[PDB]
């Protein structure tokens, strides 16, 4: 189906194109996924309140890094 | 140096910067983009503070301590006067195989080659010592806000017949010549050369002031040659400043 | 059940997605709240981890912020 | 619950991946999933923030290497 509301009808998961899901909260498009990526939209953040890991032969790529 | 695996707190500790791009600059990492693994084993330049006046400085102690820092560059802030322990060795020597990326001298005091020893009898005075021998070229950088001085030559010795006397030591701290008869030249001080032995119109030469040869004796034994301020290869002159003796 | 009426059960009755309040979703597995999202953020709860087995990317004018960084 | 939540069509959405495990899927590529301790992607599948990417609190970031543009 095209739209999965989770509680309120501005919030949940919806079709975002072929093989694409949008993650939505109070009408804001927070992020989504496709066959290769889970992502946030511009200016929307990803926060781990545990560890944040990259395992395997890949890497972390960023613009800049702040270590407190 | 930055060490893994905790590269993050290690670079914060080494560089003082939380932002990786600015930590990279402290580690002299110029690639952009850069892999943070390239921080490992690199160090921010080290800054040494010398406020101990030292009239017996040994160039080999400094070489050893520089080599202990490996490739890390070293800045030395010299805030107290320094004199080589002997005129036969420069105060500072920077061998061509030093590993440090660069060495900076920030000179805020007077640094000197040692004065040369006064000659005795028919011998000339001995040469003043050199201040800096530089064999790493532009990897030595000098910010002279004080004085860099080659040592004065020792005075020429005196002899006529059986009378033998000694010349004065070159500035700084050059030894007066000690003759077989204890007709000796004066040791120099830090601030002035030593007087040769004198008897009326007869005398052994006085020591030379910094950067100058010793005086000839009344018997025409020549003074020792002037010590030199900087010898060997040209450093990068951040500030030339006040220099006694030749440099390059 | 433990996910309640404003929930999407996936597999079993205590795994899936649960409303957290207006504009909030909880990501739940075996009744543990692993993480969630709201209008500004996707996140994990305290002590719950985010792991990429590919690349982990920050694109654009923001940045990566952390307490420490371990490089193997 | 459901074995599968179809989003768009039956090849894209969320699936049961085991006991307390969910698969995140798109055109039947298994992109990632979650369990009671972790949200994760599968091998070679990426997580990308187009805002900030944060590790907040007493944990840490663990990686193989990190590239700063
Ligand atoms: Mg609405
Ligand atoms: Mg779009
Ligand atoms: Mg609303
Ligand atoms: Mg000047
Ligand atoms: Mg269960
Ligand atoms: Mg299809």
Q: What is the 3-state secondary structure (H, E, C) of D8-62?
A: CEEEEEEEEEECCEEEEEECCEEEEEECCCEEEECCCCEEEECCCEEECCCCCEE
Q: How far is CA B213 from CA B126, B154, B239, B244, in A?
A: 9, 7, 26, 12
Most D CBs within 10 Å: which of C51, C61, C63, C71, as the mutation test of the D interface? C51
Size of interface C-D (CB pairs under 8 A): 166
**What φ, ψ does residue C12 adopt, rounded to 5°?**
-135, 170
In 3D, which of B77, B82, B86, B84 has the Cα closest to residue B53?
A: B82
Cβ contact, residue pair A48, D69, below 8 Å: no
- Report the DSSP pairing between strands A65-67 and D61-63: unpaired
C-beta separation of B126 from B188 below 8 A: no
Domain that holds residue C3: 1-72
Give partners of C (≥3 CB pairs < 8 A). A, B, D
Question: What dihedral angle (degrees, nearest 10) is formed by the CA atoms of B97, B98, B103, B108?
Answer: -100
Specify the DSSP element, H or E, that contains A62: strand A60-62
Asked if B81 and B144 sit in the same domain, the reply is: yes
- Kindly state the tokens that stand for B170: 């070159």
Asked if B23 and B84 sit in the same domain, the reply is: no
C-beta separation of B169 from B153 below 8 A: no
Most D CBs within 10 Å: which of A18, A31, A50, as the mutation test of the D interface? A50
Nearest CB to B5; choose among C66, C67, C71: C71
Domain that holds residue B120: 115-128+151-227
- C-alpha B65/C-alpha B83 separation (Å) is 18
Experimental resolution (Å) = 1.7
Inform me whether the C-beta atom of residue D42 falls under 8 Å from chain A C-beta atoms.
no
Q: Which residue has the tokens 């040494």?
A: B48
Inform me whether the C-beta atom of residue C23 falls under 8 Å from chain A C-beta atoms.
yes
Q: Looking at CA atoms only, how far is residue A7 from chain D in angstroms?
A: 16
Inform me whether the C-beta atom of residue D49 falls under 8 Å from chain A C-beta atoms.
yes
C-beta separation of C32 from D37 below 8 A: yes
- C-alpha B79/C-alpha B66 separation (Å) is 18
Q: Looking at CA atoms only, how far is residue B23 from chain A in angstroms?
A: 10
Beta bridge partners of D62: A53, C70
Inform me whether the C-beta atom of residue D41 falls under 8 Å from chain A C-beta atoms.
yes
Q: How many domains does chain B have?
A: 3
Nearest CB to D52; choose among C48, C62, C72: C62
Partners of residue D53 in chain B, C-beta under 8 Å = none
Q: How far is CA A29 from CA A11, A32, A41, A42, B200, in A?
A: 9, 8, 7, 9, 104
- Report the DSSP pairing between strands C41-44 and A45-48: parallel
Cβ contact, residue pair C69, B8, below 8 Å: yes
Beta bridge partners of D5: D14
What experiment produced this structure? X-ray
Distance from residue A5's CA to the centre of ligand 1 (Å):
10
Cβ contact, residue pair A65, B20, below 8 Å: yes
Asked if B166 and B108 sit in the same domain, the reply is: no
Q: How many domains does chain A have?
A: 1
């Amino acid at each position: 189906s095209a739209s999965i509301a989770i509680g309120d009808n501005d919030t949940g998961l919806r079709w975002g194109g072929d093989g694409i899901v949008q993650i939505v909260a109070n009408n804001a498009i927070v992020g989504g996924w496709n066959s290769t990526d889970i992502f946030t939209e511009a200016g929307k953040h990803i926060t781990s309140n545990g560890n944040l890991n990259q395992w395997g032969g890949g890497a972390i790529y960023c613009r800049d890094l702040n270590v407190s | 140096a930055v060490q893994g695996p905790w590269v993050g707190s290690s670079y914060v500790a080494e560089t003082g910067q939380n932002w990786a791009s600015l930590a990279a600059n402290e580690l002299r990492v110029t690639e952009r983009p850069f892999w943070i693994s390239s921080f490992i084993g690199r160090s921010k330049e080290e800054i040494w503070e010398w406020t101990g006046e030292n009239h017996s400085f040994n160039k080999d102690w400094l070489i050893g301590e520089l080599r202990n820092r490996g490739g890390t560059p070293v800045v030395i802030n010299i805030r107290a006067h320094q004199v080589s322990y002997t005129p036969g060795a420069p105060l500072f020597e920077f061998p061509g195989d030093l590993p440090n990326a660069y060495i900076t001298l920030n000179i805020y005091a007077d640094i000197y080659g040692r004065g040369g020893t006064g000659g005795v009898a028919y011998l000339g005075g001995n040469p003043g010592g050199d201040c800096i021998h530089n064999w790493i070229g532009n990897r030595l950088r000098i910010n002279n806000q004080g004085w860099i001085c080659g040592g004065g030559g020792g005075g020429g010795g005196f002899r006529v017949g059986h009378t033998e006397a000694g010349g004065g030591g070159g500035r700084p701290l050059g030894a007066g010549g000690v003759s077989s008869l204890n007709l000796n030249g004066d040791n120099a001080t830090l601030g002035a050369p030593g007087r040769g032995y004198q008897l009326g119109n007869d005398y052994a030469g006085n020591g030379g002031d910094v950067g100058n040869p010793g005086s000839a004796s009344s018997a025409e034994m020549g003074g020792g040659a002037a010590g030199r301020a900087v010898v060997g290869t040209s450093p990068q002159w951040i500030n030339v400043g006040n220099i006694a003796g030749s440099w390059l």
